[PDB]
Amino acid sequence: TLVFSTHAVISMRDGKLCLMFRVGDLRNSHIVEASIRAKLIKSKQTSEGEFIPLNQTDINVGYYTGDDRLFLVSPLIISHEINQQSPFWEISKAQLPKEELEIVVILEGMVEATGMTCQARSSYITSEILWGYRFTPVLTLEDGFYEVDYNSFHETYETSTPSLSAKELAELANR
Amino acid sequence: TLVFSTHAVISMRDGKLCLMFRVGDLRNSHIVEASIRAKLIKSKQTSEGEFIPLNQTDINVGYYTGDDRLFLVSPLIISHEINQQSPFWEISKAQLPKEELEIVVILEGMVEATGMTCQARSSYITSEILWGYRFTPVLTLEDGFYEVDYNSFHETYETSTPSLSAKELAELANR
């Protein structure tokens, strides 16, 4: 059994469009100085003529706000907000699948029990990002009890989501 | 055999002028918390009269954007964008060679297999920076196969590049 989301989701969170994915914890320990980071792998040719194959570019996940330093004790849903400075700013539902790209996700931290440091890498190909979905919750707050269902760790349902590019959605908003 | 670019290149990338150099990976392991940083070594006398010999100054390589935290699994081309806040802002092709300076490049990270931490330092003297060149690609995307040719790791070709100072190029752009 493993702990890292399989698919990624895109949908609305308080008006803004967001790219989301879950990240799993460790049963046998707490991770110190844990940090989540995510790169965007995708070839692109500079108008300048130079063709960079698999150029990488960083993806906002809370670097500026410090919200990329995780307190992982329970599965977390990392949420990228899709803004002007997002590489998906101009990508829409129908536009998604026909993108020749990939998202790498990297989790670093120093394990406590083991006194060693970990790095768990993973990826998502265009055909692994799900537009218009949200993650099934996996944390129920029972009577004086908080509990996770790792049986629903990957489970995702479908939600009403406009098929417009983040940029377009913000353009209509102005009107 | 080694893994760190010999010469550095300067040319255009989407309009902006950039100082570039390649950085090699490790065959026998992945590097965690890898970070690339680069200093600018060069003596300068303050108009104030004090002469600082080999004063050092940091060089933008993605600190602000977080793009200085590398995911190194394949040779990467670190690209410094030459802006107002670049120490090369006012340096042009013909101006380059006659500069009494040096660029130090430092790569830090914790190795996985070895469970030790590395620091690979290197430099470039004025006579080791190549104006108007780009790095030969070293990553071909064969039929269901990505591959590097470390035989072309240092190989560099010549490209059309204006012999103006970054500042000047931006001044003409305004007109």
Partner: peptide
């Protein structure tokens, strides 16, 4: 399209030495 990185975490290979 072929991956650069695999779900498990391993990359895609080189030829040197």
């Amino acid at each position: 399209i072929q991956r650069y990185v695999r779900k498990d975490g391993k990359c895609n290979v080189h030829h040197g030495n």
